[PDB]
């Protein structure tokens, strides 16, 4: 969160990669950075595609991943060097292996440096590696769900956000958003068929966080009430912020 117009900034399309893994993360007039990713347990693999849109080669093409001081102890990224020479119109691929150590909020920074026509081209963009990517969806009957829902003791483990919808409140879109977010989508848990209930486990090296959630649309008001309940306060916080921005 920064002050000032978010256009041509480091996170123009970051939000579009929270509930889906593929797409074009950034594109200026020389380069297009695409993404393809997959996650399992507390791990993942992200493919980064660098497309040269010009008629000439990029030289000394050097992409670097940067994780803030805290992020680093919570997220582990490993990758191999990319050939510093990218022909015009060509695409070069970089594989990033991901390991989530513990829950985190911050996002890694992708820095790209390269020479074009003899000039220094420098690009920075936030990498859409978010906490919900390490979700293991967990289907369960309504009875099980409520049993688990009422085991919350810590009031801090319950985060509720009442917000204005930033998008049309389409049902099918909303469904896809929740499924894409990562938890399982449980049917017939909330008696009101217009609401959505979710449940899943967030996987990290050191701890497994059980998470429950409830999304309540109010069509006339054009508002939502999202309710998160997990076994870890910081997890409940981060997932609520992430999901809130999607609707």
């Amino acid at each position: 969160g920064s002050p000032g117009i978010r256009l041509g900034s480091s996170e123009d399309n970051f939000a579009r990669f929270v509930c889906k893994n593929n797409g074009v993360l950034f594109e200026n007039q020389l380069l297009q950075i695409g993404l393809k990713s997959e996650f399992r347990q507390n791990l993942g693999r992200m493919f980064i595609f660098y497309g040269n849109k010009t008629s000439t080669q990029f030289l000394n093409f050097t992409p670097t991943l940067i994780c803030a001081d805290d992020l680093q102890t919570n997220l582990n990224l490993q990758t191999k060097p990319v050939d510093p020479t990218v022909d015009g119109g060509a695409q070069v691929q970089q594989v990033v292996n991901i390991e989530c150590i513990s829950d985190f909020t911050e996002a890694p920074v992708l820095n790209i440096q390269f020479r074009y026509g003899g000039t220094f081209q420098n690009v920075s963009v936030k990498l859409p590696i978010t906490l919900n990517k390490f979700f293991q969806p967990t289907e369960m009957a309504s009875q099980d769900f409520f049993q688990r829902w009422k085991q919350l003791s810590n009031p801090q483990q319950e985060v509720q956000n009442i917000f204005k919808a930033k998008h049309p409140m389409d049902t099918e879109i909303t469904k896809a958003k929740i499924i894409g977010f990562g938890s399982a989508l449980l049917e017939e848990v909330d008696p009101n068929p217009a609401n959505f209930v979710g449940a899943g486990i967030i996987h990290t090296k050191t701890t497994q966080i059980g998470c429950l959630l409830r999304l309540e649309p109010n069509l006339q008001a054009q508002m939502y009430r999202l309710t998160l309940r997990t076994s870890k306060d910081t997890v409940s916080q981060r997932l609520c912020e992430l999901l809130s921005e999607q609707f």
Binding site: S142, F146, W149, I162, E188, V189, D190, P191, N192, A194, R214, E216, P217, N218, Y224, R225, T227
Partner: peptide, 9 residues
């Protein structure tokens, strides 16, 4: 089912 309360009044 039964959440304690409901957003939509």
């Amino acid at each position: 089912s039964f959440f304690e309360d409901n957003f939509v009044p």
